[PDB]
Design a protein around this ligand. Sequence first.
Ligand SMILES: [Cl-]
Ligand SMILES: [Cl-]
Ligand SMILES: [Zn+2]
Ligand SMILES: [Zn+2]
Lengths: 21, 21, 21, 21, 21, 21, 30, 30, 30, 30, 30, 30
Amino acid sequence: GIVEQCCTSICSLYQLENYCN
Amino acid sequence: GIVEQCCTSICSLYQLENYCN
Amino acid sequence: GIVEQCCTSICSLYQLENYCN
Amino acid sequence: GIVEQCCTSICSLYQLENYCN
Amino acid sequence: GIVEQCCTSICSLYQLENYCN
Amino acid sequence: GIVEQCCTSICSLYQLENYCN
Amino acid sequence: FVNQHLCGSHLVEALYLVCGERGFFYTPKT
Amino acid sequence: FVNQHLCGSHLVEALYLVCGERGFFYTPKT
Amino acid sequence: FVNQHLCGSHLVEALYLVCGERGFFYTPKT
Amino acid sequence: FVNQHLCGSHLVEALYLVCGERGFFYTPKT
Amino acid sequence: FVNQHLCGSHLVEALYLVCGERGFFYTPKT
Amino acid sequence: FVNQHLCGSHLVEALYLVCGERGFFYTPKT
Ligand SMILES: [Cl-]
Ligand SMILES: [Cl-]
Ligand SMILES: [Zn+2]
Ligand SMILES: [Zn+2]
């Protein structure tokens, strides 16, 4: 999930938008 | 400037990006 | 809603807990 | 102290209340 | 007190240092 | 730079003033 | 625990602390 | 923009920054 | 609520959240 | 992305997230 | 150093930075 | 005052605290 994509790995601001409602 | 604009009105991440090195 | 209530008046940690997954 | 209980180990919100005045 | 002064007017890091242990 | 002085190593508040404009 | 006055990012910080690993939904009006 | 490690409080702050008014979910178990 | 690791700035933010008006002490040497 | 209302330290946090490793300059008026 | 305008959690952050390992007491009025 | 490790968001928060109105640069590649 988000922890693996953005914390464990790295992610972009655009990727973070995946988790918006 | 940007600092003042973000606080008194609003600003975008795109405007913020102009202050990166 | 909760977001607005916490900012315009006050809210409790107990009310916040209702937004957990 | 608090660092050992809450940082090194883990602690609850209720435990943190131990450090209130 | 310090908490109120920093928020309603201004305070210095030197004044803050008086609250260290 | 700053990361090596303050993150990797440790630095003082006075050292941080080196990076002020 | 005490009552809270939380705007902006400070509400999200409180949610994070309260929920931890359970996660949470942040749902502002409009 | 850039790619960085964002974890815990810092990850939720970043979701708040990017989503704002839209809202977001933080579901670390998923 | 939950149990998490809270360290440095994040630990003091959490004490602020839970204690508020009551005040608190942060005494890491003790 | 959404528009932002950012005062004080919250602007610096946003700069940090937007620029990451590139860094940034923080230049308030007077 | 410059003078500071600090409310809420931002005062606790400043105390943390100023005192570090010495710790500090946070003592708001009433 | 004291010497501590200050990294990422926490380092920029500290530069904000110490520099304020003066402004600052965060240039981690340099
Ligand atoms: Cl604020
Ligand atoms: Cl951290
Ligand atoms: Zn704030
Ligand atoms: Zn952190």
